[PDB]
């Protein structure tokens, strides 16, 4: 599955929703990131309705003041500010017969251990243990001539060592020249009675 790096629609935010986001960033509360993935099946006239499979990941924002200030500047519309979300999207995913998307854990052990082992020595909790082999997302706001035109571009970075021969190479677009975001899915179709 290849997604275009640019956004399909412009950002439909109001000034008062954006001001609220910046003000919440100013304090010391807990703000979160969110990545959502969805798969939709055909009609299936035997049981009607299209089966949908969803899963979302929440990545806490660092409590350090400098990172939050950088995020505030990025949302305000400053030129160079790559919002960074570490360990957000999985490169490999599993699509079951019904339910929520599941992570490939067998390949996770191979990637985290073999190659160049990364951290996994600071007594990391079980919440981030199953997320150590994920990719990272960087986001930029190209804006445009006016405030009405505001679009975001995404870009991914492979964990550990790049060009590790475990990665399927990406495309490069036939109109803009930017890489395509890639996800590999393992569809399960042999369903039960």
């Amino acid at each position: 599955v290849r997604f275009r790096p640019e956004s399909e629609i412009y950002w439909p935010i109001s000034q008062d929703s954006r001001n609220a986001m910046i003000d919440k960033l100013s304090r010391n509360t807990s703000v979160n990131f969110e990545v959502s993935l969805e798969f939709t099946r055909p009609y299936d006239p035997n049981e009607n309705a299209a089966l949908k499979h969803s899963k979302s990941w929440l990545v806490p924002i660092s409590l350090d003041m400098t990172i939050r200030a950088k995020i505030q500047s990025a949302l305000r519309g400053d030129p160079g500010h790559p919002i960074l979300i570490p360990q957000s999207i999985p490169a490999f995913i599993q699509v079951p017969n019904q339910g929520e998307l599941t992570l490939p854990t067998s390949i996770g052990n191979t990637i985290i251990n073999d190659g160049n082992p990364r951290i996994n020595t600071t007594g990391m909790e079980k919440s981030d243990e199953a997320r150590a082999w994920f990719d990272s997302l960087t986001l930029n706001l190209e804006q445009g001539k006016s405030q009405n035109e505001k679009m975001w571009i995404a870009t991914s970075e492979h964990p550990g060592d790049q060009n590790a021969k475990l990665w399927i190479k990406t495309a490069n677009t036939t109109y803009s020249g930017r890489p395509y975001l890639q996800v590999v899915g393992f569809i399960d179709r042999a369903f039960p009675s």
Binding site: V35, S36, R41
Partner: peptide, 21 residues
């Protein structure tokens, strides 16, 4: 008689700060 179902055709992705567009 275990059956089979067709492959997906539509895939969507979204990135957001929680509680906002």
């Amino acid at each position: 008689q275990i059956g089979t179902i067709s492959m997906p055709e539509k895939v969507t992705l979204r990135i957001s700060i929680e509680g906002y567009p």
